Amino acid sequence: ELHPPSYPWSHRGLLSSLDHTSIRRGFQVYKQVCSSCHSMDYVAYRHLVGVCYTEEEAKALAEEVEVQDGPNDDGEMFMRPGKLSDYFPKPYPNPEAARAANNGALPPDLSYIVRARHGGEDYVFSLLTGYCEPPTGVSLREGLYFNPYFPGQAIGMAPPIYTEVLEYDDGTPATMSQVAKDVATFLRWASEPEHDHRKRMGLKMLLMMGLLLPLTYAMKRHKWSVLKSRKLAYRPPK
Amino acid sequence: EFGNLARIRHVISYSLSPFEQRAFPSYFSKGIPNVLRRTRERILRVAPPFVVVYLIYTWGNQEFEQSKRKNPAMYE
Amino acid sequence: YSLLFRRTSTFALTIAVGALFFERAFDQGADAIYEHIN
């Protein structure tokens, strides 16, 4: 299988953080295009605050999807409006529903779609832009498009990003690529909500060890100088 | 414990106080020569096994690829 | 040496006090560096 090529991502930087406008744009993409079939279960409206949206913007986004509580005296499936503490919506009620609404194929939860894939984010982009006409000599069953990157090159998922599929609220031209890069950044974001933070800890950590090591070594060399200067002499009485 | 470890005789041993001596006497002055001295006494025993590991690793990779590469003569 | 390096007690005080300030200072500088990098 074709290994996805290395792309010059900003967050790939060692001391570089994630571009948060790209995470906001990639969250929009999911909200509009890929949410209806995939499930971001482990990501909730609460996680976004302080990353892509404010408290009121994320509250409005959460109030945009109703949820089910069902604790009514008799009402057992009561469907509430949804809140910040609520998690992202699910595409299908159960695994079977997924198989049913996706030609038998199960769309995997994207909660950690990238940390899952070996190629990493690159792979996601490779495929998102990897739908390709099947090389002469091959055919597929349903919604299966030869995708070189996808294992077997037969992904049930039909190509979901057509240029100008959705309009970015920021207005950045919604070209297929600009959309695949944004959703790869976002999917990366969910898989590690602390990419940035971890990197801040790594910076300070480096600096701290950077001052402690030299010093500790010095001490190691104070308390070991005594011996390292010891001069031995053999003086048989003769 | 100390005192009953061993029996030596007539071996005088001089030393200096830590604060009285330079911390890194000629550190790079002789350190480099010594490190280099050291590397040349051990490089012939250490390095050639890892060199042939590198050759076997590359070989395996390339051989594997060729193995995977379709047989042109086949299917024709 | 005559203030913080003569007797263990004196040494201890400077350590506590200095560490008290170094903490914030380190974070502050890190802020610049972190923001600088990003």
Binding site: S225, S229, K231, A233, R235 | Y14, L16, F19, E20, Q21, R22, A23, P25, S26 | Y1, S2
Partner: peptide
């Protein structure tokens, strides 16, 4: 006896003010 040989020279090591050191 005990005087014939003197302290070997540690000059090299010696850091040729003590409070400062």
């Amino acid at each position: 006896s005990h005087t014939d040989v003197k302290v070997p020279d540690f000059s090299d090591y010696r850091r040729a003010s003590s409070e400062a050191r």
